[PDB]
C-alpha cells in the first residue's frame, strides 16, 4: 500500500 506521508 501507500507510504505514510504520501497520499
Amino acid at each position, epitope marked *: 500500500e501507500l*507510504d505514510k506521508w*504520501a497520499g
Partner: antibody
Framework: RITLKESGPPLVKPTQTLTLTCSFS??????????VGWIRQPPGKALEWLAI???????RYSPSLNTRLTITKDTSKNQVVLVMTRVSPVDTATYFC????????????????????????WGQGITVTISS | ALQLTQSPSSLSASVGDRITITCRAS??????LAWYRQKPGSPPQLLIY???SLESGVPSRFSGSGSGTEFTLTISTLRPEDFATYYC?????????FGGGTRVDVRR
C-alpha cells in the same frame, strides 16, 4: 546531533526468538511524524527493509517477514524494539535501525514532506549469527 | 511487490571521473527516493533525499535527479572515499524497497 545504536545477542540458535533494541538520542519518538525503522544486510548481500514505527504509533512490516516480526517503542526510554521469532540461518545479517524525519513544520504547521523521503541517520549496525 | 533495479550493478572508475548510477522502479514512486553510499564495514550514509535534495553536510559533487520511474545519482568528480557501494531506496510504497546496489571500484 542524532545518534542510534543497536544492541542484542550476537549469536542465536535456529527456532529461537531474537530481540533487538535500538537506543537513540537527539530526538524523541514523541516528536511529530518521526519514524525509526530496521534494515538488515546478510554478509555480502544488499540491504533489506524490515519494518518501521512512527511516533503516532503506526507500524508497518515487510510482507515477507510479517508473521515473524513485532516492532514496538518505549518513548520514555528512547528505544525501539524489534522482535523476530523462529529465526533460521538465513536470518544471519547485520541489523541496522535508522531515523526517519517527519515533515518540516512552521509554527507547528506541516509545510514540507520532502524530508521524510529517506532514512537520514543510521546506527553502526549489530552483527547477528544464527547457528545451532 | 515494487521492483527497484540499479544499473550498472558494478562499475570501475578512477579518481576524478564523473560517474552516474541509475535506478528504475517498476511503478512510479513520485519523488520519494533516496540515495546512499556505504563504505565497507560502515552503515549506509544518506547522500540525497526526495530524489534530488542534497543532504546536509554531504559534499556538492553528489547530485541526484529524476522522478516517477527513473532516477540517477551522479558524482561529478570521484574522490577516493567514493569507491564504495551505492544504494537507492524507494519510500512511496510499503515495503520501502532498496535497489540491489552498485559497487564502484578502482579501474585497472
Amino acid at each position: 546531533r542524532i545518534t542510534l545504536k543497536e544492541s542484542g545477542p550476537p549469536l542465536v540458535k535456529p527456532t529461537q526468538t531474537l530481540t533487538l533494541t535500538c537506543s537513540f538520542s537527539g530526538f524523541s519518538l514523541s516528536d511529530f511524524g518521526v519514524g525509526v525503522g530496521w534494515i538488515r544486510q546478510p554478509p555480502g548481500k544488499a540491504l533489506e527493509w524490515l519494518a518501521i514505527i512512527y511516533s503516532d504509533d503506526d507500524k508497518r512490516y515487510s510482507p515477507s517477514l510479517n508473521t515473524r516480526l513485532t516492532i514496538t517503542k518505549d518513548t520514555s526510554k528512547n528505544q525501539v524494539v524489534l522482535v523476530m521469532t523462529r529465526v533460521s540461518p538465513v536470518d544471519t545479517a547485520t541489523y541496522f535501525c535508522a531515523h526517519r524525519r517527519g515533515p518540516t513544520t512552521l509554527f507547528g504547521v506541516p509545510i514540507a514532506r520532502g524530508p521524510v523521503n529517506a532514512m537520514d541517520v543510521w546506527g553502526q549496525g549489530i552483527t547477528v549469527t544464527i547457528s545451532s | 511487490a515494487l521492483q527497484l533495479t540499479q544499473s550498472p550493478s558494478s562499475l570501475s572508475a578512477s579518481v576524478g571521473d564523473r560517474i552516474t548510477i541509475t535506478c528504475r522502479a517498476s511503478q512510479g514512486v513520485t519523488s520519494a527516493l533516496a540515495w546512499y553510499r556505504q563504505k565497507p564495514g560502515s552503515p549506509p550514509q544518506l547522500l540525497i533525499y526526495d530524489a534530488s535534495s542534497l543532504e546536509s553536510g554531504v559534499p556538492s559533487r553528489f547530485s541526484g535527479s529524476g522522478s516517477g520511474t527513473e532516477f540517477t545519482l551522479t558524482i561529478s568528480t570521484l574522490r577516493p572515499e567514493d569507491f564504495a557501494t551505492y544504494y537507492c531506496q524507494q519510500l512511496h510504497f510499503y515495503p520501502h524497497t532498496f535497489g540491489g546496489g552498485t559497487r564502484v571500484d578502482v579501474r585497472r
